[PDB]
mmCIF file of C-alpha atoms and ligand atoms in Angstrom:
data_model
loop_
_atom_site.group_PDB
_atom_site.id
_atom_site.type_symbol
_atom_site.label_atom_id
_atom_site.label_comp_id
_atom_site.label_asym_id
_atom_site.label_seq_id
_atom_site.Cartn_x
_atom_site.Cartn_y
_atom_site.Cartn_z
ATOM 1 C CA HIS A 1 137.453 149.499 192.734
ATOM 2 C CA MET A 2 137.455 146.362 195.063
ATOM 3 C CA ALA A 3 137.145 142.585 193.530
ATOM 4 C CA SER A 4 133.690 141.331 194.103
ATOM 5 C CA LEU A 5 132.922 137.497 194.275
ATOM 6 C CA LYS A 6 132.133 137.063 190.752
ATOM 7 C CA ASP A 7 134.635 138.941 189.432
ATOM 8 C CA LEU A 8 136.162 135.540 190.250
ATOM 9 C CA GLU A 9 134.243 133.734 187.658
ATOM 10 C CA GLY A 10 135.264 132.050 184.344
ATOM 11 C CA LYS A 11 137.817 129.573 182.770
ATOM 12 C CA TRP A 12 141.437 130.576 183.654
ATOM 13 C CA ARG A 13 144.458 129.097 182.171
ATOM 14 C CA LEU A 14 147.941 128.915 184.804
ATOM 15 C CA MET A 15 150.460 131.396 183.562
ATOM 16 C CA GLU A 16 153.195 131.551 185.901
ATOM 17 C CA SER A 17 154.558 130.282 189.009
ATOM 18 C CA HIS A 18 156.600 130.518 192.229
ATOM 19 C CA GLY A 19 157.704 128.713 194.776
ATOM 20 C CA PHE A 20 155.154 125.522 193.719
ATOM 21 C CA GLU A 21 157.237 122.612 194.648
ATOM 22 C CA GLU A 22 158.450 124.193 197.662
ATOM 23 C CA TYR A 23 154.687 124.537 198.926
ATOM 24 C CA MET A 24 153.794 121.009 197.240
ATOM 25 C CA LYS A 25 156.710 119.582 199.337
ATOM 26 C CA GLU A 26 155.799 121.231 202.916
ATOM 27 C CA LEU A 27 152.057 119.239 202.330
ATOM 28 C CA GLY A 28 154.067 116.155 201.695
ATOM 29 C CA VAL A 29 153.502 115.299 197.585
ATOM 30 C CA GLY A 30 155.814 113.080 196.531
ATOM 31 C CA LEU A 31 158.734 113.798 193.705
ATOM 32 C CA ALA A 32 156.924 111.962 191.584
ATOM 33 C CA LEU A 33 154.003 114.230 192.015
ATOM 34 C CA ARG A 34 155.303 116.589 191.992
ATOM 35 C CA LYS A 35 157.127 117.241 188.984
ATOM 36 C CA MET A 36 153.703 116.003 187.546
ATOM 37 C CA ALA A 37 151.736 118.683 188.661
ATOM 38 C CA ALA A 38 154.171 121.059 187.752
ATOM 39 C CA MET A 39 154.294 120.098 184.163
ATOM 40 C CA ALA A 40 150.841 120.973 184.052
ATOM 41 C CA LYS A 41 149.641 124.121 182.745
ATOM 42 C CA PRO A 42 145.534 123.913 184.405
ATOM 43 C CA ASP A 43 142.282 125.483 184.123
ATOM 44 C CA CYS A 44 140.888 126.194 187.170
ATOM 45 C CA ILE A 45 137.275 126.977 185.715
ATOM 46 C CA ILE A 46 135.385 129.192 188.591
ATOM 47 C CA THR A 47 131.583 129.315 189.085
ATOM 48 C CA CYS A 48 130.000 131.535 191.500
ATOM 49 C CA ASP A 49 126.396 131.092 192.273
ATOM 50 C CA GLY A 50 125.478 133.696 194.421
ATOM 51 C CA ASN A 51 127.311 132.506 197.925
ATOM 52 C CA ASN A 52 127.769 128.514 195.721
ATOM 53 C CA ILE A 53 131.127 128.578 195.128
ATOM 54 C CA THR A 54 132.924 126.208 192.510
ATOM 55 C CA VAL A 55 136.155 125.477 191.575
ATOM 56 C CA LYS A 56 137.291 122.624 189.404
ATOM 57 C CA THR A 57 140.971 122.154 188.638
ATOM 58 C CA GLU A 58 141.312 120.879 185.082
ATOM 59 C CA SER A 59 144.496 118.837 183.463
ATOM 60 C CA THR A 60 144.556 115.837 181.425
ATOM 61 C CA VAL A 61 146.190 114.124 184.604
ATOM 62 C CA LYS A 62 142.997 114.485 187.670
ATOM 63 C CA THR A 63 139.843 116.900 187.376
ATOM 64 C CA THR A 64 139.764 117.676 190.466
ATOM 65 C CA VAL A 65 136.352 119.964 191.830
ATOM 66 C CA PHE A 66 134.594 121.506 195.180
ATOM 67 C CA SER A 67 131.744 122.786 195.675
ATOM 68 C CA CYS A 68 130.604 124.428 198.442
ATOM 69 C CA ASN A 69 128.526 127.794 200.471
ATOM 70 C CA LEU A 70 130.129 130.856 201.152
ATOM 71 C CA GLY A 71 131.870 130.275 205.685
ATOM 72 C CA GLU A 72 129.912 126.544 206.052
ATOM 73 C CA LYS A 73 132.840 124.469 206.830
ATOM 74 C CA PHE A 74 133.337 121.033 204.450
ATOM 75 C CA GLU A 75 134.871 118.023 203.690
ATOM 76 C CA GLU A 76 137.597 118.049 200.694
ATOM 77 C CA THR A 77 139.410 115.358 199.442
ATOM 78 C CA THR A 78 142.317 117.680 197.580
ATOM 79 C CA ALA A 79 144.322 116.636 194.218
ATOM 80 C CA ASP A 80 146.970 115.034 196.046
ATOM 81 C CA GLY A 81 144.557 113.182 197.990
ATOM 82 C CA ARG A 82 144.655 114.464 201.337
ATOM 83 C CA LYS A 83 141.334 114.534 203.113
ATOM 84 C CA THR A 84 140.657 118.063 204.993
ATOM 85 C CA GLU A 85 138.214 120.145 206.440
ATOM 86 C CA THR A 86 138.011 123.513 204.415
ATOM 87 C CA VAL A 87 136.042 126.743 204.647
ATOM 88 C CA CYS A 88 136.107 129.262 201.966
ATOM 89 C CA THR A 89 135.503 133.143 202.673
ATOM 90 C CA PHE A 90 135.303 136.302 201.330
ATOM 91 C CA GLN A 91 138.606 139.022 202.610
ATOM 92 C CA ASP A 92 139.544 142.136 201.327
ATOM 93 C CA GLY A 93 138.563 141.107 197.289
ATOM 94 C CA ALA A 94 140.081 137.480 198.162
ATOM 95 C CA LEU A 95 138.273 134.029 198.214
ATOM 96 C CA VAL A 96 140.227 132.938 200.988
ATOM 97 C CA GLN A 97 140.405 129.097 201.266
ATOM 98 C CA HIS A 98 141.538 127.677 204.672
ATOM 99 C CA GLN A 99 142.137 123.571 205.193
ATOM 100 C CA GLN A 100 142.886 121.799 207.746
ATOM 101 C CA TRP A 101 144.193 118.586 208.587
ATOM 102 C CA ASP A 102 146.097 116.427 211.239
ATOM 103 C CA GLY A 103 146.326 119.510 212.566
ATOM 104 C CA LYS A 104 148.031 121.296 210.080
ATOM 105 C CA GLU A 105 146.628 123.913 208.037
ATOM 106 C CA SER A 106 147.107 125.513 204.513
ATOM 107 C CA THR A 107 145.629 129.175 203.281
ATOM 108 C CA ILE A 108 145.099 128.870 199.153
ATOM 109 C CA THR A 109 144.268 133.193 198.774
ATOM 110 C CA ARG A 110 142.423 133.922 195.109
ATOM 111 C CA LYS A 111 142.295 137.617 194.129
ATOM 112 C CA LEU A 112 141.970 139.505 191.369
ATOM 113 C CA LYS A 113 144.803 141.652 190.611
ATOM 114 C CA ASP A 114 145.284 143.620 187.148
ATOM 115 C CA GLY A 115 142.719 141.394 185.195
ATOM 116 C CA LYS A 116 144.638 138.305 186.225
ATOM 117 C CA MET A 117 144.118 135.687 188.974
ATOM 118 C CA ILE A 118 146.660 135.639 191.858
ATOM 119 C CA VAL A 119 147.448 132.234 193.775
ATOM 120 C CA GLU A 120 148.578 132.631 197.051
ATOM 121 C CA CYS A 121 148.978 129.267 199.348
ATOM 122 C CA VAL A 122 150.754 129.508 202.216
ATOM 123 C CA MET A 123 151.910 126.336 204.397
ATOM 124 C CA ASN A 124 154.157 126.963 207.767
ATOM 125 C CA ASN A 125 156.930 128.810 206.127
ATOM 126 C CA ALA A 126 156.478 127.694 202.716
ATOM 127 C CA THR A 127 154.694 129.864 200.032
ATOM 128 C CA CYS A 128 153.874 129.940 196.178
ATOM 129 C CA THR A 129 152.557 132.272 194.204
ATOM 130 C CA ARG A 130 150.237 131.139 190.976
ATOM 131 C CA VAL A 131 149.416 133.576 188.329
ATOM 132 C CA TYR A 132 146.067 132.799 185.908
ATOM 133 C CA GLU A 133 144.777 134.718 182.661
ATOM 134 C CA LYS A 134 141.022 134.858 181.584
ATOM 135 C CA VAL A 135 140.604 132.049 178.564
ATOM 136 C CA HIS B 1 124.422 94.965 180.322
ATOM 137 C CA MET B 2 124.514 97.217 183.252
ATOM 138 C CA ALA B 3 124.829 100.682 183.408
ATOM 139 C CA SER B 4 127.908 102.071 184.973
ATOM 140 C CA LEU B 5 128.139 105.300 186.641
ATOM 141 C CA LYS B 6 129.990 107.167 183.689
ATOM 142 C CA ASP B 7 127.316 106.070 182.059
ATOM 143 C CA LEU B 8 125.787 109.336 183.792
ATOM 144 C CA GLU B 9 128.290 111.504 182.453
ATOM 145 C CA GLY B 10 126.086 114.342 180.111
ATOM 146 C CA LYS B 11 124.339 116.998 179.770
ATOM 147 C CA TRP B 12 120.705 115.728 179.770
ATOM 148 C CA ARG B 13 117.420 118.185 179.375
ATOM 149 C CA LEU B 14 114.260 117.344 181.210
ATOM 150 C CA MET B 15 111.413 115.486 178.846
ATOM 151 C CA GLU B 16 108.714 114.265 181.405
ATOM 152 C CA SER B 17 107.815 114.368 184.680
ATOM 153 C CA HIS B 18 105.314 112.403 186.779
ATOM 154 C CA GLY B 19 104.178 113.605 190.317
ATOM 155 C CA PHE B 20 106.560 116.373 190.469
ATOM 156 C CA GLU B 21 104.208 118.895 192.399
ATOM 157 C CA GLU B 22 103.452 116.346 194.893
ATOM 158 C CA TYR B 23 107.144 115.259 195.625
ATOM 159 C CA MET B 24 108.319 118.827 196.508
ATOM 160 C CA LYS B 25 104.827 119.014 198.527
ATOM 161 C CA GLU B 26 105.504 116.451 200.296
ATOM 162 C CA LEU B 27 109.282 118.164 200.215
ATOM 163 C CA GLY B 28 107.559 121.531 201.816
ATOM 164 C CA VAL B 29 108.251 123.370 198.715
ATOM 165 C CA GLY B 30 105.399 126.533 198.625
ATOM 166 C CA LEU B 31 102.561 126.945 195.217
ATOM 167 C CA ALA B 32 105.180 129.391 193.847
ATOM 168 C CA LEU B 33 108.663 127.768 193.996
ATOM 169 C CA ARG B 34 106.856 124.377 193.043
ATOM 170 C CA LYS B 35 105.094 125.829 189.562
ATOM 171 C CA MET B 36 108.470 127.601 189.352
ATOM 172 C CA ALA B 37 110.223 125.116 188.904
ATOM 173 C CA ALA B 38 107.241 123.109 186.916
ATOM 174 C CA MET B 39 107.493 125.306 184.388
ATOM 175 C CA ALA B 40 111.734 125.017 184.331
ATOM 176 C CA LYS B 41 112.697 122.543 181.849
ATOM 177 C CA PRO B 42 116.199 122.148 183.519
ATOM 178 C CA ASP B 43 120.048 120.660 182.140
ATOM 179 C CA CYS B 44 121.321 118.399 184.679
ATOM 180 C CA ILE B 45 124.828 118.177 183.723
ATOM 181 C CA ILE B 46 126.875 114.988 185.644
ATOM 182 C CA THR B 47 130.511 114.517 185.613
ATOM 183 C CA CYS B 48 132.299 111.730 187.241
ATOM 184 C CA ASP B 49 135.569 111.839 188.011
ATOM 185 C CA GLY B 50 136.457 108.269 189.071
ATOM 186 C CA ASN B 51 134.059 108.364 192.257
ATOM 187 C CA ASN B 52 133.662 111.889 192.127
ATOM 188 C CA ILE B 53 130.318 112.938 191.528
ATOM 189 C CA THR B 54 129.135 116.757 190.429
ATOM 190 C CA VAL B 55 125.697 117.269 189.708
ATOM 191 C CA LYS B 56 125.108 120.659 188.382
ATOM 192 C CA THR B 57 121.092 121.593 187.782
ATOM 193 C CA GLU B 58 120.498 124.183 185.854
ATOM 194 C CA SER B 59 117.665 126.766 184.905
ATOM 195 C CA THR B 60 116.683 130.648 183.738
ATOM 196 C CA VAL B 61 116.097 130.393 187.769
ATOM 197 C CA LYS B 62 118.441 128.977 189.279
ATOM 198 C CA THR B 63 121.819 126.875 189.445
ATOM 199 C CA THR B 64 122.532 124.183 191.881
ATOM 200 C CA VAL B 65 125.486 122.159 191.891
ATOM 201 C CA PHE B 66 127.258 119.130 194.660
ATOM 202 C CA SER B 67 130.419 117.910 193.854
ATOM 203 C CA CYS B 68 130.511 114.540 196.495
ATOM 204 C CA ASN B 69 132.622 111.173 196.786
ATOM 205 C CA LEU B 70 130.461 108.603 196.417
ATOM 206 C CA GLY B 71 129.430 106.886 199.827
ATOM 207 C CA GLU B 72 130.951 109.767 201.847
ATOM 208 C CA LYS B 73 128.264 112.185 203.528
ATOM 209 C CA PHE B 74 128.039 115.866 203.055
ATOM 210 C CA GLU B 75 126.246 118.426 203.474
ATOM 211 C CA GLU B 76 124.046 119.670 200.948
ATOM 212 C CA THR B 77 121.767 122.847 200.332
ATOM 213 C CA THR B 78 119.339 121.582 198.024
ATOM 214 C CA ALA B 79 117.634 123.920 195.107
ATOM 215 C CA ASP B 80 114.367 124.866 197.340
ATOM 216 C CA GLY B 81 116.823 125.577 200.355
ATOM 217 C CA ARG B 82 116.812 122.459 202.389
ATOM 218 C CA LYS B 83 119.891 121.577 204.921
ATOM 219 C CA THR B 84 120.382 118.354 204.696
ATOM 220 C CA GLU B 85 122.979 115.300 205.411
ATOM 221 C CA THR B 86 123.414 113.367 202.143
ATOM 222 C CA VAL B 87 124.763 109.787 200.862
ATOM 223 C CA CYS B 88 125.485 109.278 197.185
ATOM 224 C CA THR B 89 125.885 105.216 196.527
ATOM 225 C CA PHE B 90 126.364 103.309 193.584
ATOM 226 C CA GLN B 91 123.345 100.207 193.309
ATOM 227 C CA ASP B 92 122.205 97.892 190.443
ATOM 228 C CA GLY B 93 123.145 100.748 187.469
ATOM 229 C CA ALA B 94 121.684 103.635 189.793
ATOM 230 C CA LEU B 95 123.395 106.817 190.905
ATOM 231 C CA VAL B 96 121.276 106.794 194.685
ATOM 232 C CA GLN B 97 121.236 110.172 196.348
ATOM 233 C CA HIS B 98 119.752 109.466 200.177
ATOM 234 C CA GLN B 99 119.153 112.931 202.358
ATOM 235 C CA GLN B 100 118.530 113.338 205.645
ATOM 236 C CA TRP B 101 117.188 116.345 207.461
ATOM 237 C CA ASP B 102 115.014 116.888 210.650
ATOM 238 C CA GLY B 103 114.429 113.664 211.132
ATOM 239 C CA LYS B 104 112.807 113.658 207.434
ATOM 240 C CA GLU B 105 114.414 111.731 204.730
ATOM 241 C CA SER B 106 114.289 111.536 200.719
ATOM 242 C CA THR B 107 115.848 109.367 198.030
ATOM 243 C CA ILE B 108 116.504 110.471 194.172
ATOM 244 C CA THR B 109 117.930 107.789 191.969
ATOM 245 C CA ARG B 110 119.232 108.062 188.729
ATOM 246 C CA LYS B 111 119.936 105.521 186.403
ATOM 247 C CA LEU B 112 120.331 104.765 183.100
ATOM 248 C CA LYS B 113 117.189 103.143 181.318
ATOM 249 C CA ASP B 114 117.299 102.513 177.453
ATOM 250 C CA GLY B 115 119.466 105.448 176.668
ATOM 251 C CA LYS B 116 117.224 107.747 178.917
ATOM 252 C CA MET B 117 117.937 108.984 182.279
ATOM 253 C CA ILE B 118 115.082 108.365 184.505
ATOM 254 C CA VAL B 119 114.767 110.104 188.057
ATOM 255 C CA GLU B 120 112.984 108.086 190.664
ATOM 256 C CA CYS B 121 112.164 110.506 193.540
ATOM 257 C CA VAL B 122 110.826 109.267 196.870
ATOM 258 C CA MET B 123 109.424 111.107 200.142
ATOM 259 C CA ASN B 124 107.268 108.657 201.965
ATOM 260 C CA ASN B 125 104.521 108.051 200.331
ATOM 261 C CA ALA B 126 105.214 110.360 197.992
ATOM 262 C CA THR B 127 106.786 109.320 194.844
ATOM 263 C CA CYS B 128 108.174 111.028 191.413
ATOM 264 C CA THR B 129 109.653 110.226 187.796
ATOM 265 C CA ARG B 130 111.798 112.736 185.811
ATOM 266 C CA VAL B 131 112.389 111.547 182.348
ATOM 267 C CA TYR B 132 116.081 113.141 180.653
ATOM 268 C CA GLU B 133 117.477 112.597 177.070
ATOM 269 C CA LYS B 134 121.201 113.218 176.093
ATOM 270 C CA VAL B 135 121.701 116.688 175.117
HETATM 271 CL CL1 CL C 201 135.589 116.681 196.804
HETATM 272 CL CL1 CL C 202 126.120 122.835 198.483
#
């Protein structure tokens, strides 16, 4: 049973984090914002209205929301304040979010694994795995 | 006391509608979708995370959501399925949403009046006033 896009819908609470600091480092996030992001245990709320995907990132510090249509490039302002060109695709049971800015690129992959949502973030040689459970 | 952008935040329920059919007509919405839109009494949920504005339009037929930053042009897919270039501004206590597509243009204005949210929609000679109350 391969995942679907609707399977990602829900309120998700962060439970585990590996390599997050090093990823935010590679992005250019200052120490201050890094220790602030790491102390947070966000909610990630995802809604899938057909191929219209909204991802709301909720914390006590900042709330960040983008809404896109699958496969249509859009302008994203990231939680760390980057202006990027982004495309979400659905590949092999995973929501793949590709960001480009300043000739740099990062990929965030969100997939369902064993009832959990696994978030993989790659920038250059820096990788990070976050694990979320369903609220 | 002039309105603010935060004053628009909330779940809003449609209470009154004037000239809606004629507006959807001017947009090119078929009779079917028109009687379907008119029978609905949507929720409009609005959230204002600084100048990051999200407007979720909720019905039993379709849920539509866009998220933008005030003053930055973005690509919107409208509930009737138009692909438009849109800019939201804040002018004189009103959220002003300007859409362009195919050299056509429409403005949706959302303002707080006497505790109610008044939605004015203008396309060409066709105008429409919707009135929403706070849930
Ligand atoms: Cl955004
Ligand atoms: Cl959209």
